[PDB]
From a paper:
In this work, we demonstrated that PECs in agarwood are biosynthesized from a common precursor featuring a C6–C5–C6 skeleton produced by a diarylpentanoid-producing polyketide synthase, hereafter named 2-(2-phenylethyl)chromone precursor synthase (PECPS). The last remaining candidate gene encodes a PKS (PECPS) sharing high amino acid sequence identity with the other four PKSs, as well as the highest 93% similarity with AsCHS1, and this gene maintains the Cys-His-Asn catalytic triad conserved in all known type III PKSs. The crystal structure of PECPS showed typical homodimeric type III PKS folding. Crystal structure analyses suggested that PECPS utilizes unique one-pot catalytic machinery that includes the release of a diketide-CoA intermediate, which has never been reported in other known type III PKSs.
However, a comparison of the structures of PECPS and naringenin chalcone-producing Medicago sativa CHS (MsCHS) suggested that PECPES may differ from MsCHS by the so-called ‘coumaroyl-binding pocket’ (pocket A), which is thought to lock the aromatic moiety of the intermediates. To investigate whether the small pocket A is required for enzyme activity, we mutated Phe340 to the bulkier residue Trp and found that the mutant retained its 1-producing activity and binding ability with 4-hydroxyphenylpropionyl-CoA at levels comparable to those of the wild type in HPLC and isothermal titration calorimetry (ITC) experiments. Furthermore, the crystal structure of the F340W mutant indicated a similar size and shape of the main catalytic cavity to that of the wild type, suggesting that pocket A is not required for substrate and intermediate binding during the enzyme reaction.
Residue numbers in the entry:
A (entry chain A), B (entry chain A): 7 to 391
Write the structure that this text describes.
Amino acid sequence: EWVRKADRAAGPAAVLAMATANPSNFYLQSDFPDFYFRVTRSDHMSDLKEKFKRICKKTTVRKRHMILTEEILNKNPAIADYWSPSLAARHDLALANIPQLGKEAADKAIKEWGQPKSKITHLVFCTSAGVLMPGADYQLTMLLGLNPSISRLMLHNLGCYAGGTALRVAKDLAENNGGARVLVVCSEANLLNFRGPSETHIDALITQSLFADGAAALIVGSDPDLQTESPLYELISASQRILPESEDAIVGRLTEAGLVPYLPKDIPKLVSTNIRSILEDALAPTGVQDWNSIFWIIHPGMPAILDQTEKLLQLDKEKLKATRHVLSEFGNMWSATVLFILDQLRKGAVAEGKSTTGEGCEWGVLFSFGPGFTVETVLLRSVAT
Amino acid sequence: EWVRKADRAAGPAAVLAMATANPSNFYLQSDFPDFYFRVTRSDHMSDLKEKFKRICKKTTVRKRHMILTEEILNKNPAIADYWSPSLAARHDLALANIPQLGKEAADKAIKEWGQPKSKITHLVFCTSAGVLMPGADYQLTMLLGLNPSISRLMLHNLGCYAGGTALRVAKDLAENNGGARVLVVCSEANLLNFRGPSETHIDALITQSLFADGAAALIVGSDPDLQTESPLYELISASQRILPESEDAIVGRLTEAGLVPYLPKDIPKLVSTNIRSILEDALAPTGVQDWNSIFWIIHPGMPAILDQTEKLLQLDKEKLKATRHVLSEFGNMWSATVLFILDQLRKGAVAEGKSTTGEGCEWGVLFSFGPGFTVETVLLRSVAT
């Protein structure tokens, strides 16, 4: 049937602008083992340093931007310890850095959007870098000077999959509210996860070689005014799922010493078992038969998952090109990573001169994962260039 | 104009079922000063004990349900200290209690609903009692055995206003997804805020006399099947707002010793200045002229705000009856409090035999507040009985 439009939106939610940002300080992966084991006063565990050398090189990561410098770690030595009371000091750094880093990505995205900031009616903010009261959603509202009546959603500590959660949330906000313009900001950092090495906890050490800082920002709206606004993608469907037989696969305890992770169950085998059934369910209303006829955004939380999925569905090596570029150039930035990849994919399609923002393909899938074991899946539709 | 219904819902979001729950252990307010100053090994600060006696009696609170017993505090003495490392112990108690308490409220609400749990497509979970990874939204999904493909939203540490945020979120989920049934669960406790007294920090002591444990649960859906489903209220509008000149009015730092509050600015004066402009804006599409022609749900975070608002708009003393009942019988349960009040208001209207679930009135306003200074406002429409 047909319903009265009233105050709701007509068409599907669309990505209207994107931008990213990182702290200025970065670390090359080739130099990181020496720096890490030095500032964490840990040069004596030489056998662990060799293990970290091997782990860091299999990450296929080149550089990672980080708020934490040697000087900051020197004035907060408990953060460099493997396990010492440091939460309040980490949260002071989060208050001084997380909303500000999110404003840098938001400013660029609003600049590309072209419309006034007073047209932003909703704000979705994801971060696992610090629990703040009021949250970083409020701090960004003040720094940007957004409307005091903005409808905000603060998402604390959902994990690495929250990039898909933010897209899933913004979709419902924009499609159900006429004229709604949703600012999406994922601002992440290692302020809660960074700690010294332990020969006992190799899970925590492995995460020290991938996690990095960064912030992504989007403008999501339905019914775009095509004379002033330019859509980049369409959010057609977004769903969440808990993988079967995956209890306590990823657990992160927030303690007096910050965020401590635990990864007992095998993650790549869990994704490899379910990846096909999930993505086929997402592509069901599209009629796509070739896995290589769509563009891809996979959360590079574990690079081995990129390789095994590339093999299992027999993808062109160029399909995951934007995914591996962000991983190589920026590392794992929690929820911001998949939005970084969506922007790099957009830029690469425009640069190499292809017909669609989705590298010439019409449909695309976004897939991230985290504690649950939770899987977030989004079906995207590209636009002509 | 008219748009194709497609996969969206036709009518506004409706509250289809409600229920509450509390821990079995409770404390009468008349006995609390002796118990508090005894288990926090603090009987020697006699002048502070007298201050607490006076504060506790002005709360107009009778009893408060609490997970923390004397024995539990005895096996976790750092929780009883004013400021000692205790976060991990608090989060162990949150893992063992918060999802379970939310399941008790959810079971009763699903029982009143009558439909199978496999019809629940969305879950919204609010808590400020513990940051968990995976969250209490996942734990409830497992305990209830809800669909693994449920769309979840975990809201950590938004504060006291999150009861209105959950209603604001569920409204968009139900109205934009056809057939969607949204389970809303606010499960709160003092596991992060409870601590010993300090003659230095009187803000923290005042919160020790109001905050309490409890969980509320709703089923929210649009387009109700009126032969099996019975609506109780309608969510017509829900908005968020930051009050002008209110920076750092309520701040809660999450530290190694748990949640420490700071309340420097005057809260009742902030609400009294803005309460009328906000509620008039919410009632604008209703045509209501008498403030006593609508029913009321005000977050009883500060009882002085109930009295000043009652005076300022000259309300019948019976308007805030359900609000003061929950405050007297249960205290401040963070986001669950206003949903407790909505249920008591529903029960009181049915018991005293009135024409509407809103005590005979047609329209009603829900109003909660917290860190920001943030204000959440919801316009409700009652239903015939």
